Amino acid sequence: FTTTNEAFQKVQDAVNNNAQALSKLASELSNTFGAISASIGDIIQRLD
Amino acid sequence: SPLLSGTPPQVYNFKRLVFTNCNYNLTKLLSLFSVNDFTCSQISPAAIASNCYSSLILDYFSYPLSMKSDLSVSSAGPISQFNYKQSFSNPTCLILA
Amino acid sequence: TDTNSVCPKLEFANDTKIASQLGNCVEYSLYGVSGRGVFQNCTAVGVRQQRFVYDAYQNLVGYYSDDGNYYCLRACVSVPVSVIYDKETKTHATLF
Amino acid sequence: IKYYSIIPHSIRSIQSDRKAWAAFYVYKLQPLTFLLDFSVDGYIRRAI
Amino acid sequence: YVDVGPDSVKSACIEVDIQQTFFDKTWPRPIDVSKADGIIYPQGRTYSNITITYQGLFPYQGDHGDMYVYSAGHATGTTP
């Protein structure tokens, strides 16, 4: 088991793909879709 | 203190007070005067009392209650047209006291 | 866009302070930063002069209080809920 | 502010005793995207 | 209007001599991004143990810049 071994890299790649799917959801909540603030509560207090 | 001292200028000659980094208590200023009319655009009048902004601009002038309708962005009256204009893009709260 | 220098004057009697509220989900309004989070004590991290400490994702993770103790900040965590149901017996169970 | 100038300073030292003065370098600031590395102390040790 | 105190009593003022060639000495000091020369810290917030891309006013990498030197005035033993 080493970086050189192709099979070991494939096992790591499968773990990375699962991690990437989870990471996307967490990142999108931080992202703001055309709004003053990502937080729903922060927009409510500052807007009518 | 400048707002509470001396004679306020006319609407065309309105003085400008700009606050960038200070804690503000709008209610305390409102309590000293009596507010006959409170109107706000692009934000709630209640919301303006407790929210944070990069900068706050306050303009103080003597304006009579009788011509309040003339001083509006929607109004085409001369006082809004020539004497004073408030930028539409940034949220603006107008208070008559 | 990112900085709000002017903020409403607010007064803390004593109990409404970060100290003695550690480990409790609480609404925080420190120097114009408003959020709901759990406060903890962690070793001082980041520049002390800048009280707000942010992660790479721009989420507040640490704060420097007037008392001078650095405080770890985390969002309050929800309890996941799932239901086990059998149609034939009309019986239900809850896995938290 | 559209313009700036450097005001020359001369030290009226005795001819026998004089001190060399370090030169100061002025660099213009341009909007740029910089990769910044932050240490545990939080100071930016290196940038790209 | 703030007051800086009294203006100089003497209308006459000291003579100066302009010699750019004397100040024309080359000592190049290019900005190095590796040592983070001339980097303004984000005034909005502090970041710890993270690497991020930040947009801000920054000097060009490898910029020699403009060099200005200050020198002692001409003197004759007791009087400059």
Side-chain angles (χ1 to χ4, degrees), chain A, chain B residues 1-27 29-97, chain C, chain D, chain E residues 2-80:
Chain A
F1 310 126
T2 176
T3 61
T4 92
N5 183 21
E6 300 88 10
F8 179 71
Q9 286 306 298
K10 293 178 180 60
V11 188
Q12 189 64 53
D13 292 348
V15 164
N16 297 343
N17 296 346
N18 298 354
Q20 287 296 137
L22 299 190
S23 180
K24 173 200 303 297
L25 296 178
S27 177
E28 288 292 331
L29 283 185
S30 304
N31 181 34
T32 318
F33 314 101
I36 57 171
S37 176
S39 171
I40 302 199
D42 198 15
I43 87 104
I44 291 176
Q45 64 183 7
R46 293 164 51 187
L47 282 175
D48 51 293
Chain B
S1 35
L3 187 149
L4 292 170
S5 64
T7 158
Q10 294 304 325
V11 48
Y12 54 89
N13 218 0
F14 69 103
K15 297 180 194 306
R16 186 183 325 272
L17 254 61
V18 43
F19 312 108
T20 159
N21 194 2
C22 49
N23 299 346
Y24 78 102
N25 195 359
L26 191 56
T27 310
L29 177 66
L30 285 176
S31 178
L32 257 302
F33 283 91
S34 45
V35 38
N36 208 359
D37 180 33
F38 200 131
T39 165
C40 202
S41 176
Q42 296 186 1
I43 178 181
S44 286
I48 207 63
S50 52
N51 60 332
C52 293
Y53 348 87
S54 180
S55 64
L56 189 146
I57 307 176
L58 206 153
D59 302 336
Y60 82 100
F61 47 88
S62 51
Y63 196 76
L65 256 297
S66 176
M67 43 192 51
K68 58 180 179 58
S69 58
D70 301 354
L71 199 62
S72 301
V73 277
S74 57
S75 177
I79 326 189
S80 56
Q81 188 179 2
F82 306 101
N83 292 261
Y84 162 76
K85 188 140 304 172
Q86 34 203 11
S87 325
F88 50 92
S89 302
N90 39 23
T92 309
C93 259
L94 187 69
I95 288 88
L96 247 67
Chain C
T1 312
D2 220 10
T3 54
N4 283 347
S5 301
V6 38
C7 278
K9 174 197 183 307
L10 287 162
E11 49 267 2
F12 38 97
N14 187 211
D15 61 327
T16 164
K17 190 57 189 62
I18 313 209
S20 93
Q21 293 290 336
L22 305 181
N24 308 329
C25 172
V26 284
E27 279 277 359
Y28 59 83
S29 182
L30 330 159
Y31 289 81
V33 170
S34 51
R36 200 183 301 180
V38 182
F39 275 102
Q40 194 167 131
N41 196 4
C42 284
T43 167
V45 113
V47 177
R48 179 163 288 266
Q49 276 78 8
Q50 311 262 11
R51 38 171 36 93
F52 308 118
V53 186
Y54 280 86
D55 59 10
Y57 324 99
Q58 280 69 234
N59 306 326
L60 195 64
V61 283
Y63 173 72
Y64 280 98
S65 187
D66 294 347
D67 49 55
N69 309 143
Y70 173 81
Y71 290 119
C72 250
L73 189 42
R74 293 161 206 81
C76 315
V77 281
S78 304
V79 170
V81 185
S82 49
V83 47
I84 317 141
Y85 162 73
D86 181 40
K87 183 180 179 177
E88 317 300 320
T89 59
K90 292 296 184 300
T91 309
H92 39 77
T94 309
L95 177 65
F96 282 104
Chain D
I1 309 182
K2 306 293 296 299
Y3 313 97
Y4 80 95
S5 181
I6 277 76
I7 319 170
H9 187 94
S10 283
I11 288 86
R12 303 193 70 176
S13 59
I14 295 301
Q15 189 181 26
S16 70
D17 182 30
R18 286 169 173 173
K19 295 299 183 304
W21 304 112
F24 64 91
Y25 306 82
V26 169
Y27 311 92
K28 288 303 180 61
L29 287 172
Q30 304 94 9
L32 276 164
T33 308
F34 266 41
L35 183 62
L36 298 180
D37 188 22
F38 294 88
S39 42
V40 186
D41 45 90
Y43 295 131
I44 314 179
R45 303 311 179 182
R46 52 177 190 177
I48 270 185
Chain E
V2 176
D3 189 10
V4 286
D7 288 343
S8 67
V9 185
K10 334 154 301 301
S11 60
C13 56
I14 315 298
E15 185 187 358
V16 325
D17 181 26
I18 301 179
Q19 287 292 326
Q20 180 55 241
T21 166
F22 276 76
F23 292 85
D24 274 333
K25 321 215 66 60
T26 55
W27 296 308
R29 270 197 169 91
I31 283 289
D32 189 22
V33 85
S34 178
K35 41 184 56 62
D37 284 350
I39 297 308
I40 314 185
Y41 200 83
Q43 39 266 359
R45 44 208 57 183
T46 190
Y47 293 89
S48 172
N49 215 14
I50 42 205
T51 306
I52 74 166
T53 46
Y54 174 76
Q55 306 190 178
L57 295 182
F58 289 120
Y60 278 151
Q61 158 72 351
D63 181 28
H64 295 281
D66 302 340
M67 185 207 59
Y68 308 92
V69 197
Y70 288 153
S71 85
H74 269 154
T76 45
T78 59
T79 301

